[model samples]
Every structure is written in structure tokens, then in C-alpha cells.
Target: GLGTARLQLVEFSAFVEPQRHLFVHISQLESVDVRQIYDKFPEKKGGLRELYDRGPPHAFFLVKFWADLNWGFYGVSSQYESLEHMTLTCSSKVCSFGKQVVEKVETERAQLEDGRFVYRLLRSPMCEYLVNFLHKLRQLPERYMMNSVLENFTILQVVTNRDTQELLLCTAYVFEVSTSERGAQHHIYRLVR
Candidate 1:
């Protein structure tokens, strides 16, 4: 009674790059420009178009909930340009209550130093669940959490750089599960960036 779902990046924006940044502030100059640089030099391998033409990467999460409904664990694995895996557990009902808590409040906007605007849920239950989810992601093996891209509807942000007038798009993904006597049904929540 387990299944997986995927959402096309085109639903959110024209450009989709599976790079994620958390905590530490990083400069844009250090990052490569897929459209501007890669598109200009098509001969080069691993260009943005090449990557896009191949297809979007798969970000997978294997989650299992206990009968108690108060504890559970999830493992995140991805096969993009690279490979990664992460395992995490929650002792509280945070994961189980995430959906209900998130619906109770409105999202608040905040600007990061890196020029990205984030819309975050403000309630303690929602906030705590989000914080814990992020903390668990950081525990990936070989410390590859920073290099891993987020899957499902986790974060959505708008990116802008001072050097460039163009606005960049970011997106989020969410997964939900409902348990019953028969089995569990999974749902994927895809949102616009």
C-alpha cells in the first residue's frame, strides 16, 4: 500500500533547477547560470538544456507511520544528477498534525540575505513541524544534506539578484498519507512557485 507521485516543473515556472540552499548564506556569483551560460554554449555537456531534455530528477521519500499516530520515520532518496539518501524519525505527532496545523494559519513573508523571499507558516505547530523537518534533512549521510534538493511541497520562494533584473522561480512539494483498516492512501500536493 505504498505509491509515489511526481509533478512536472512546467506547472510552476519555465525554468526549474533542483538546487537547494539552507541556513548559510551563499552568493549568486559562485553559482553557474544555466540559461545564460549553458544555453550560449550548447556544445558543452551537462548544460541546462541537456539536463532538462533528459528529464527532471526523482526525489523520493519513504515514510512509515506507527499505529500510535504519535511517532514515525521517513527516508528521503534522490536520483538527480547525483545520488543521495536521508533517514529521519519524529517522536511526536508533528508529521501527523502538519496538514491540520498549516491550514489554521496564514503564511507570513520574510526576506533572506540572499535576496530570496520566503512565505512561511507562522503557527507554533506548523513552525515546529517545519523546523523539525529541516533539522532531519540536515542529518543526511556524508553530510550531503546541503547538496540535496527538496522534494514534494516543502518550500517555495522567489529569488531575485541585484546584478540581474530578472526574477527567478522556486517551488515546493508536499506528501500526505491517510491510514485505515484496509491500508494507507498517499496524496501529493503540488503548489505553484
Candidate 2:
């Protein structure tokens, strides 16, 4: 469901209802210092500290995917500040082959431009059905991927000058995402200057 009744920011708490494959996108109103968030949340302190202080590493955790691996995305911030224009997209809509899942991809993919976005990604639960699928991908699969296993993970990026193309940097984690590739995984129009 998009938006109805009144426009409100949707808050899906991972601690409350952990739904695998449920994700979100948000446009920010303030520039957040990653260190600040890390400082406040002690449980997440080490992970955030390592992520901000050392920059990108081989793998990071946004969910608790056990027995099998999951995937994630990344991008860079346009400024030292948090983010201005954010575009957060999800992956489950395309990857899964469940009848209960989206049977048809949208005909008109929404046109997103410069805007702040916050992506909230969900994970597969430790349920019988999903677990069974994982086992299948495992037994007859060629690869087992955990996003944390990625050598490189870029979260948010932007277009250069007036061109709505070209990824500018690989610093910030709170950024944009696309499902397709060489440029955006699924996007990119570029110019160095």
C-alpha cells in the first residue's frame, strides 16, 4: 500500500516485527553523523563504529540471515552532511518466485529524481517455507551469497551536474539503490566533472 488517508512516514521496527524481504525508502530532513547514531546505540556501537571509522569492509549486517546468505546494496552521500535527496528501492519484488509475492513487475517503474531516501530492508524468517527454499538453493546451487560477504557494497550515489546519471562517490551508506547494473546495479549516467 502506498499512501492513504494522511501522508505519514512508515516506521517498520526490526525489533518489533521482523519480516524478511520487507524494505523501505526515505528522504531525509537532516544530515546525520554516523558516529552520533553509533554512540547512542551501544548494542550497535561496534558495527557502526567500524563502518564509519574504517569506511567500507568486505561485509556488514542489516539482518540476521542464518543457515543461508542474503544480499544488500550501497551508495555515497552528495555531501559531508547526511543526505538531501534519497531514493530507497527494494529487491524482493524482483528476485523471489513466489505466487504470494509480486507476480508481475510494475510496467511503469516510478521515475525518481534527486531526493532524500531511507531504505529499510527486511530478511527471511527462520520459518519452514523460506528455510526449505534456502536449503534447495544450497543443495543445487553454485553460490551462497551473504551481503556481508561482498568485497564491496555501495549504498547511495548521485548524478553529476544536470545529467541524472553517473555515480559520484562511494562514501555514504544512507543513499540510493537500483536493482539492475554496470552503473546502478541498474543505473548510471555520468561525467567526471
Candidate 3:
């Protein structure tokens, strides 16, 4: 359907070298594609080397570790509930891929128990994207009326609002992507509609 499945595939090859971190949680994957490094080095994969002698067109791709989140490496791009926590950036330009900071709303309070679980509601990472995308999509004005603090009830109401579930799911598709490093035995995916 898309060039013998090979052309449609984006292969992520991992190396042993350490990495650079953009955010506190997400570390950058550098030079997973052969195009990223071959320019400066001489190599001999021989006949195999000729295919990449000019290097592949899709040069750069990035991934970060969503450690211990139990998020699948690859699943239908949509309906992956834990995906809100992942970071994936890509583009046809390749080098243009980048990750943005997650604007979180809710806070977690500590309880004095062994399983210290305390918080009225744990906000998902996609919530911020959801609100922004919804506003832009619906052409709503940027009113600084919503309280971002813990005491605000509006956010809670919106998050648990069953009526808006359909809208929120749309935002999730754009926000969630691959977060684990390559060679981790998993890759994030989405359902194509």
C-alpha cells in the first residue's frame, strides 16, 4: 500500500552512547537514523552501505522514555489511555521534530500512609493540550478566566464531564506519541481514520 511496507516503515535503531535531555522527564534520541551521523564518518557496510551512501530521506526521529508507565510501545494511536504521558515529535523535514513542555494543571498531595495516595483528581498530561486545541478548534476567545490552582472546581468539572468525552479524544490523537527509547521492545501507534 505504501511502497512495500518498507517505505512506510520508520526504523529506530538504538546505540549505547548517552543522550541529551530537553525537559526533566524527556531525553532526546540522537542519530537513530543513519543520515544523522554518516556525513562525518567513513564506513564500509559494503553493498549494504550503498543504499545509505546517500542516506535515507527521512533523517531525524526522536523518542523519550515513559518509564514504568505500562504504556504500550505500539498500539492504535488512539485509545491508548496512558499515552497522555508520552512525548513524540517528527516531521517530513526530519530535523524539525521537537518536544514541547507539558502544561500541567492538577497537583498531588501526600498522605501519611504506606501507599501514600492523596489527590482529589490526577490530571492527565493531555488535558492541557485538550483545552488549548478545543479553544483553537472552536475559535473560542482566550479568556484568562479559568483558575489553574488546586482550589478551582471548573477544571474538575470539565475533566469528569461525560458530555465532552468525544471532544477530548480528538485532542488525545495529536498529543500522544512514542516515548520509549528504541530497543525497548515497544512502540506507540495510532488508529488511522
Candidate 4:
């Protein structure tokens, strides 16, 4: 059941130089036509990177996956002078199928166990794309339920620090399933790292 599922970090990758943006990719491999979802965000000005570069050393970074949308989101928080958190909020434009589309990415701040901040994605273009893709997949004879395709998907997170000394890498997969109920006709997904 969903309540019994938990997130587990599988392994860490080699360190790489830091960059201006963090990136994540999720792909579906079992289907005849594979679907790929990608998201990237720039460093938040006056945020963790700046704080770490100046003096303080203790910092934490996290990348979360939305199973329902097959998209990844991330947050950066650190303990320098005080507990602070940051996330990206911007508008993106993309051209698909001969049409131009614009989408806004938004984030909300939340507190962790240590009173540090973590920002979560409130809405993103990747989510929008997956919702439509999943809707169509559901109409097929072999409905693509969360459990059915869970193992066929792969998730990756890659990011670097301000000084380019260490790289943060993670592998995540779907670990929880939310079934539709009588009152609500929606499914929620959870990812484990």
C-alpha cells in the first residue's frame, strides 16, 4: 500500500564540476513509442550556492520525482548564518508540433526536520505533458497503471556546487501507488531514491 512504501537511495555517482543549472530526466522504455521527460532549473540567486561559496560548509540538496507526472523536481537548502532555502520560478517557451507553447514553473517552500527549507514544484510543464500522455495511455486495451509500468521507467538527477568541487547524483524509482477512490477519480504517485 502507499502508506507502507518508502524512499531509498540506491547509489551515488562520481563528482563533477558545478554548473549554472541542475537537470533531471525520466524515461519510459516498455512502450512501443518511448516517452522522455526532462526538467532543469538555474541556481537561485543569493541562495545556497552563494552562501556555501562565501563561508559556511553544511549544505543539503534534494531532487524529488512526481510519479503521476513522471517528472523530477529539486530544492536547495543550507545552514550558513541561518536556515535558508531556494527554488526556481520562471516562464519557459518551447516549440512543439509546429506550435509555440509557454509554461510557468512555480515552487513553494517547505520546512524539513532540522528547520531547514526545501522548495517543491507547485506546477511545471513536464507535469502537463505527462498528464496528457498518461491519459491517452490509459485508454489502451492494456491500461498503463502505476504498478504495471513502474519498473520500466528510469530517473536520474545531476547537479553541481558553486565551486565545482563536488557533484550530487541520485537514482530514483516509483515506490508508492495511489489508486482511485469512489469520490475522487485520480491517481497519485510517489518516488523513492
Rank order (by TM-score, best first): 4, 1, 2, 3
Report the lDDT tens digits of candidate 4 across residue range 1-193.
1111111122211111223121222211111101122212213322223323443222222233332222123222221111433332322222232232333333333336455443333222344554454455445443245446543433223222223424222112222223233111212233211
Candidate 1: stretches off by over 4 Å: 1-104, 107-126, 145-149, 157-193
lDDT of 1 at 188: 31
lDDT tens readout by residue for model 3, 1-193: 1111111221222121124222113111122443443322223232112323333323212232222211101110111112122222111111101222232332222233333222222112233443343334234222232212101111110011132221111111111212335222332232121
lDDT for 7 in candidate 4 is 17
Per TM-score, the best of the predicted structures is: 4
Alpha-carbon deviation at 133 in model 2, angstroms: 4.6
Clash number for each model? 6, 26, 9, 2
Q: Which should have the higher TM-score, number 1 or number 4? A: 4
lDDT of candidate 3? 0.22
lDDT of 1: 0.24
Clashing pairs in 4: 8-193, 9-193
Model 1 TM: 0.21
Best by lDDT: 4
lDDT of each: 0.24, 0.25, 0.22, 0.28
Model 4: residues with Cα > 4 Å off, grouped in runs: 1-117, 127-129, 141-150, 162-165, 175-178, 181-193
Tell me how far the alpha carbon of residue 109 in candidate 2 is from the true structure, in angstroms, after superposition: 13
Model 2: lDDT of residue 138? 35
Provide the TM-score for each candidate, comma-separated. Answer: 0.21, 0.19, 0.17, 0.30
State how far residue 153 of model 1 sits from its true place (Å): 4.6
Model 1 is weakest, by summed lDDT over 10 consecutive residues, at 7-16
